[PDB]
Amino acid sequence: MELIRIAMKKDLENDNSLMNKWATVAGLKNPNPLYDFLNHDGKTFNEFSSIVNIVKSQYPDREYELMKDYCLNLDVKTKAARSALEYADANMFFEIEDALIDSMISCSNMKSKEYGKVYKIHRELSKGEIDVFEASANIGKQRIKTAEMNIFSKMLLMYDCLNKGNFAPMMLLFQQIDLSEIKENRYLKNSFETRINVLLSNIYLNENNLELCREYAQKAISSTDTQRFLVFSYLTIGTSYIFSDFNLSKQNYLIGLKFAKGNPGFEEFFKRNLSFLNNFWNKENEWINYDSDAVTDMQEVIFELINHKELSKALQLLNKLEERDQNENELGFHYYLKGLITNEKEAFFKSVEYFKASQDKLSIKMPLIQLEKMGENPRLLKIITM
Amino acid sequence: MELIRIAMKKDLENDNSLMNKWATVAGLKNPNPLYDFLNHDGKTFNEFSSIVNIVKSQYPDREYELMKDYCLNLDVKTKAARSALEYADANMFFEIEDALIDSMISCSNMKSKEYGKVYKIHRELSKGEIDVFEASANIGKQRIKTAEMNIFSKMLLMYDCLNKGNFAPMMLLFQQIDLSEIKENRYLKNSFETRINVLLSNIYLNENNLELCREYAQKAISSTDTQRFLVFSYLTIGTSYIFSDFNLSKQNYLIGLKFAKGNPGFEEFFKRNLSFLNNFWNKENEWINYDSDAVTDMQEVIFELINHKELSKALQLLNKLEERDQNENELGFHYYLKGLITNEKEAFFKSVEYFKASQDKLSIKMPLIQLEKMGENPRLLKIITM
DNA sequence: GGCCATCACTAGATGTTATAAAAACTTAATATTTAAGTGATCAAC
DNA sequence: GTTGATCACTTAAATATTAAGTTTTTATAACATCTAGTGATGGCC
Numbered sequence: 001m002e003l004i005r006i007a008m009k010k011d012l013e014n015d016n017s018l019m020n021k022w023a024t025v026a027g028l029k030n031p032n033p034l035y036d037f038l039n040h041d042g043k044t045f046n047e048f049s050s051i052v053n054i055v056k057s058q059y060p061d062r063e064y065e066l067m068k069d070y071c072l073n074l075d076v077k078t079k080a081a082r083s084a085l086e087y088a089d090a091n092m093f094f095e096i097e098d099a100l101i102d103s104m105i106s107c108s109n110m111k112s113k114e115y116g117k118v119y120k121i122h123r124e125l126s127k128g129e130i131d132v133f134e135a136s137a138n139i140g141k142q143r144i145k146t147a148e149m150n151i152f153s154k155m156l157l158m159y160d161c162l163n164k165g166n167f168a169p170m171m172l173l174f175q176q177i178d179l180s181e182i183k184e185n186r187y188l189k190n191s192f193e194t195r196i197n198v199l200l201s202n203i204y205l206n207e208n209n210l211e212l213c214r215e216y217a218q219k220a221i222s223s224t225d226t227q228r229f230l231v232f233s234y235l236t237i238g239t240s241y242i243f244s245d246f247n248l249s250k251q252n253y254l255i256g257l258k259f260a261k262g263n264p265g266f267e268e269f270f271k272r273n274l275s276f277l278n279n280f281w282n283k284e285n286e287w288i289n290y291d292s293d294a295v296t297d298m299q300e301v302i303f304e305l306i307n308h309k310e311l312s313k314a315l316q317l318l319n320k321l322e323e324r325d326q327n328e329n330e331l332g333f334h335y336y337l338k339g340l341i342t343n344e345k346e347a348f349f350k351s352v353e354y355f356k357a358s359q360d361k362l363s364i365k366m367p368l369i370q371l372e373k374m375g376e377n378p379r380l381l382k383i384i385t386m
Numbered sequence: 387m388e389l390i391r392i393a394m395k396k397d398l399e400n401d402n403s404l405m406n407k408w409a410t411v412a413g414l415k416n417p418n419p420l421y422d423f424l425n426h427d428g429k430t431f432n433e434f435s436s437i438v439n440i441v442k443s444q445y446p447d448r449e450y451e452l453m454k455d456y457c458l459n460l461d462v463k464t465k466a467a468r469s470a471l472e473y474a475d476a477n478m479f480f481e482i483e484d485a486l487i488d489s490m491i492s493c494s495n496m497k498s499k500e501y502g503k504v505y506k507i508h509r510e511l512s513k514g515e516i517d518v519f520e521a522s523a524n525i526g527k528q529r530i531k532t533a534e535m536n537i538f539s540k541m542l543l544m545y546d547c548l549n550k551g552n553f554a555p556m557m558l559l560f561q562q563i564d565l566s567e568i569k570e571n572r573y574l575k576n577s578f579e580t581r582i583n584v585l586l587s588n589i590y591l592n593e594n595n596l597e598l599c600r601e602y603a604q605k606a607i608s609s610t611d612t613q614r615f616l617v618f619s620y621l622t623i624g625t626s627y628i629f630s631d632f633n634l635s636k637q638n639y640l641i642g643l644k645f646a647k648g649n650p651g652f653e654e655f656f657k658r659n660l661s662f663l664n665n666f667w668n669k670e671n672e673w674i675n676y677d678s679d680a681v682t683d684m685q686e687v688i689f690e691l692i693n694h695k696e697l698s699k700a701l702q703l704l705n706k707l708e709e710r711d712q713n714e715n716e717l718g719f720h721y722y723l724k725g726l727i728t729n730e731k732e733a734f735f736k737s738v739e740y741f742k743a744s745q746d747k748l749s750i751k752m753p754l755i756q757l758e759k760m761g762e763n764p765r766l767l768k769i770i771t772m
Numbered sequence: 773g774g775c776c777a778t779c780a781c782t783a784g785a786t787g788t789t790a791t792a793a794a795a796a797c798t799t800a801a802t803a804t805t806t807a808a809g810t811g812a813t814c815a816a817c
Numbered sequence: 818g819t820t821g822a823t824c825a826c827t828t829a830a831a832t833a834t835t836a837a838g839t840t841t842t843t844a845t846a847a848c849a850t851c852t853a854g855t856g857a858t859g860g861c862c
Contacts, residue, residue, distance in 0.1 A: 016777060029853055035779055036851090046786085046851055078850095079787070109788075110842095131558055133543060136519050137526030143842085157519060164554070172517055184787080349765055356772045379735050380766050386742050402822060419807060421824055432806055432831085464805095465832070495833075496797095529797090570832085 001041075003069045004051070007059060009038055025057045026050035042075060048083030048187040056225060064093070071096050076116075077109040082148075083187045085119055090191050090226050098123065110145070117142055118149045122156035132160045147181035148188050155192065158199050165359055167207050174200070194224040201236050208361045208385075210240045230259040231266045238273055243365060246281045253277065272296060279303035280366075295321065295330045299337060306340050315341050329358035336367050345374055352384060361385070387427070389455045390437070393445060395424055411443045412436035428461060434469030434573045442611065450479070457482050462502075463495035468534075469573045471505055476577050476612055484509065496531065503528055504535045508542035518546045533567035534574050541578065544585050548592075551745050556589050580610040587622050594747040594771075596626045616645040617652045624659055629751055632667045636660065658682060665689035666752075681707065681716050685723060692726050701727050715744035722753045731760055738770065747771070 012018050023031035027050060036043045045051055055066050071084040081100060088097035097119065104116025118139070125135040139153040154173045161170040177196065182189035201216035217233040217240070224230060234256025241249035253274050260266035271287050278285035279300055288304055289297040298321060305314035318338055326334060332354035339347035351367035368381045398404050405417035413436060414420065423429045431437055441452050457470040467486060474483035483505065490502025504525070511521040525539040540559045547556035563582065568575035587602035603619040603626070610616060620642025627635035639660050646652035657673050664671035665686055674690055675683040684707060691700035704724055712720060718740035725733035737753035754767050 019777075031777095032779075032854085033852060035777095039779075044850085077788075108790095111788090132555070133522050133540075133559065136522035140523030140526030141529070143527070154519075168550070169518075173519065349769065352769055353772065356769065376766065377762065380762065380770070383735070383738055383742065384766075384769050386739065405822075415808060417822095418809085418824075421822095422806090425824075430806085463833080497833090 002073050004055060004059075004066045005038055007062075007066070008054075011058070012038070022054055022058070025053045027053065044074070044078060044080035046079070047185075048080060048087060049190075052087060068093070068096055072099060074100075076100065076103040076107045076112050078112070079185060082112055082115045083185060085115055086188050086191050089119060089122070090195070091228055094123075114142065114144060114146060114149050118144070118153050118156070121153070122159070125156055125160050132157060135160065147183065148185055151177050151179065151182065151192060152188075155195055155199070158196075162199055162202055162206075165206055167203055170199070170203050190223065191226075194220050194226065194229050197223065198229050198232060198236075201233060205236050205240060206361060210244070213237075213240050227259060227263070227266070231256050231263075231269070234259060235269055235273065238270075238277075239362070242273075242277060242280065242362070246277065246283070249277050250274065272300075275300040276303075279307060282307050295324065295326050296333075299330075299333050302337050303340075306337060311341050327358070328354045329360055329363065332358060332360065332363055332367075336363075336370075339367060339370055343374070345371065345376070348374070356384070388459050390441060390445075390452045391424055393448075393452070394440075397444070398424070408440050408444070411439045413439065430460070430464055430466040432465075433571075434466055434473060435576075438473060454479070454482055458485060462486065462489040462493050463498050465497075465571060468498055468501045469571060471501055472574050472577050475505060475508070476581070476614065478614055480509075500528065500530060500532060500535050504530070504539050504542065507539070508545070511542055511546050512549075518543060521546065533569065534571055537563050537565065537567065537578060538574075541581060541585070544582075548585055548588055551592055553589055553593050556585070560586070576609065577612075580606055580612065580615050583609060584615055584618060584622075587619065591622050591626060592747065596630070599623075599626050613645060613649070613652070617642055617649075617655070620645060621655055621659065624656075624663075625748070628659075628663060628666065628748070632663065632669075635663050639663065658686075661686040662689075665693060668693050681710065681712055682719075685716075685719050688723050692723060697727050713744070714740045715746055715749070718744060718746060718749055718753075722749075722756075725753060725756055729760075731757065731762075734760075742770070 008018075008022075019031040019034050022034055023029070026034065026045065027047070028034065028045075033043075033045060033050075037045070051070065052067070055063055055070075059066055067087065071081075071088060074081040074084055081104065085097060085100045085104070088094075088100055101116045101120050101123070104112045105120065107113060107116070121130075121135050121138045121142075124130045125132065130138070136157060139156075142149075142153075144150050144153060154177055158170050158173045161173065174196065179189055179193055179196075182192070197216045197220035201213055201220060204210075204213035204216060214237055217236045220229055220233045234252050238249050238253035238256060241252065253270050257267060257270040257274075260270060271289075275285060275287035275289075275297075277283075278287060280303075285300075285304055288300050290301060292298065298317070302314050302317050302321075305311075305317070314337070318334065318341070321334060332351050335347045335351035335354060338344070339351055348367040348370050352364055352371070355364035355367070364385060368385065372378050372381055394404075394408075405420050408420055409415070409417040412420065412431065413433070414431075419429075419431060419436070423431070437456065438453070441449055441456075445452055453470075453473065457467075457474060460467040460470055467490065471483060471486045471490070473479075474486055487502045487506050487509070490498045491506065493499060493502070507516075507521050507524045507528075510516045510524075511518065516524070522543060525542075528535075528539075530536050530539060540563055544556050544559045547559065560582065565575050565579055565582075568578070583602045583606035587599055587606060590596075590599035590602060600623050603622045606615055606619045620638050624635050624639035624642060627638065639656050643653060643656040643660075646656060657675075661671060661673035661675075661683075664673060666689075671686075671690055674686050676687055678684065684703065688700050688703050688707075691697075691703070700723070704720065704727065707720060718737050721733045721737035721740060724730070725737055734753040734756045738750060738757070741750035741753070750771060754771070758764050758767055
């Protein structure tokens with residue numbers, strides 16, 4: 001018997017009003033399906049949200065271990081298990097996802113075989129075990145029946161397009177999606193609407209189109225309770241405001257930090273961004289990590305020194321970092337800081353060049369603003385960012 | 387009976403030494419296969435070059451009519467017909483190609499079905515009836531057996547990559563090709579070596595990498611006597627020299643013009659390029675078309691006027707052209723000419739902008755050289771071409 | 773006496789399975805055709 | 818008497834086709850599982 005059913009049975013023995021409340025949360029008109037859920041082994045709900053809404057409302061602090069145990073006990077032949085796969089992948093619960101894919105490939109149900117295979121392609125592609133042509137070929141081979149995996153196979157490609165910065169082909173795949181084809185599984189339809197909106201959000205930020213980027217980040221947030229999509233949407237909104245509005249930047253970053261509670265990985269994104277936002281706007285900065293070997297953290301300590309007019313100590317530390325292997329996007333920030341200390345145009349030109357080589361359409365604005373103040377042709381500096 | 391066999395039979399009745407000479411040209415160690423070719427209906431050669439070499443050596447002035455008739459009378463179920471398809475496509479003989487594909491799709495031979503289908507994908511893709519994901523999926527679906535169409539399906543994608551200026555994925559597909567897999571059909575292996583060398587040549591010219599571009603254009607020329615590959619290789623070498631070496635530019639264009647004799651379409655590429663080369667280097671220009679409505683021809687008459695210091699007549703004509711819908715690459719050249727007449731930096735800035743928007747990494751050098759003379763920071767101008 | 777949890781029936785819309793029908797797919801085993809030898813046969817000279 | 822065009826043998830390697838033994842689609846049909854109603858039964862107040 002699944003931990004979720006044990007914990008619901010224990011709680012209902014105490015507070016006998018819970019079933020009508022669980023129905024409301026599960027979107028059920030009456031709780032007969034929930035009595036059937038607690039009473040009869042391997043009962044499932046038509047829509048996987050019935051179970052997720054409840055695990056979320058009622059046992060939030062144990063969502064992983066509960067949904068793991070429930071997902072890893074499901075009939076892989078069933079719509080529930082195809083939904084579990086989307087929930088697994090959307091939250092980046094790989095142990096669960098890979099396990100559900102394994103079972104669904106070698107299973108007897110044609111829908112669950114399809115979903116299982118297409119998710120394997122998405123997994124292999126995102127990990128870097130295959131390129132987009134291999135992937136797009138494995139899709140073609142699969143002879144996809146369902147509107148669901150027709151849409152999702154286009155989306156798994158949109159993710160690889162997003163990794164390579166490639167707007168034109170992403171939008172080409174996006175034009176071909178009509179989510180109103182998804183009729184069987186409304187959990188997927190809604191989870192895919194969140195994915196598309198997050199995707200559009202990240203490609204528009206990358207194409208340095210800030211107003212659309214927020215429009216789509218907000219649609220994503222309206223439409224979801226999934227931690228991963230909330231964290232990234234607020235990060236994307238936070239970054240959309242770095243140069244235009246310090247409070248909206250800080251506000252969206254802090255909201256995203258709340259939603260990342262107990263995922264140090266997700267929390268560091270916000271801490272590092274808030275570190276940079278505050279140093280950039282010359283504010284007291286509580287987010288610095290004075291203990292970190294990481295080039296990015298050592299840069300923010302240098303940037304604070306520069307803001308505190310400790311130019312000689314900043315230059316001593318920057319020249320120690322030159323002795324050290326840095327990627328191009330790091331050297332972009334290096335020469336920008338060497339620029340702020342020395343007021344040498346050459347440093348800013350290298351900063352612009354390194355950001356240009358790293359395909360960073362956002363950081364490049366930093367050394368370009370300094371070059372416009374030092375009197376370089378604005379019309380030329382604009383041409384560099386096109 | 388095929389026209390090629392009629393005309394070979396007629397000529398041999400006159401000069402009875404021809405068979406041993408035709409064998410040498412056909413790469414045959416003795417002419418028994420050629421007696422079998424003339425004597426017995428539907429005899430074919432192991433390698434389609436045996437027949438092409440001869441039609442080329444012996445009846446050059448009627449190569450289309452002869453090879454059409456021979457190709458469109460072949461057993462589509464045979465290696466010859468799969469070779470005819472490559473020869474059809476390589477020379478852009480679409481009437482023949484599409485006809486051979488039609489017959490090979492609905493035929494009973496597994497190899498000739500495969501080749502027939504893969505060429506349809508290449509045709510649909512190049513024409514713009516499908517995008518690269520559709521194509522890459524149709525390949526995946528086809529369950530390709532043969533090393534030949536494994537390599538060719540990668541190549542048909544490299545053509546779409548080339549159209550969209552996408553170096554990274556082109557080279558990714560290229561890394562995966564090993565032509566030493568082709569064991570059955572040495573005609574395809576050699577024809578594909580020419581295609582990939584031409585492909586590499588055009589992508590490197592586009593990435594403004596001129597020495598590699600020539601290296602590959604030259605390998606292509608070594609490896610072939612196909613008009614279309616010769617024409618484009620010499621055009622590519624011609625263009626590779628436009629800014630660096632006027633004589634090598636003019637020389638390679640003129641060689642390519644000889645090889646284009648009697649294809650007005652191919653000849654216009656050379657005439658228009660020689661028109662521009664001569665105007666650019668301020669030489670007497672015989673190639674101008676004073677009669678043409680075409681924006682690019684009217685630009686070269688303006689450019690000659692500018693070289694002859696008839697600036698007021700040049701400005702009158704340029705201002706007529708503004709009244710007129712032009713693509714971005716045309717407006718790039720427009721503002722460059724408006725620049726040369728008026729000495730207005732704004733015109734050169736627009737020229738740089740329009741070349742940048744049209745992804746023309748070669749023409750952009752033109753307005754950039756003017757901006758460097760007018761005193762603009764060369765270190766900044768270099769960053770624009772990164 | 774009324775309300776409210778419980779929960780098995782129930783109707784009907786939906787989702788799953790299973791069970792032959794018809795296609796596409798290996799495979800291996802002949803069967804054709806190929807280049808290039810060998811050797812008449814007639815012409816030439 | 819020699820030569821060299823002609824051509825059908827030939828052999829042995831390579832290309833092709835047929836066949837029949839496996840998977841794989843398919844579809845129309847026959848069965849389970851859903852949600853949300855209905856109604857029972859029993860605490861509770």
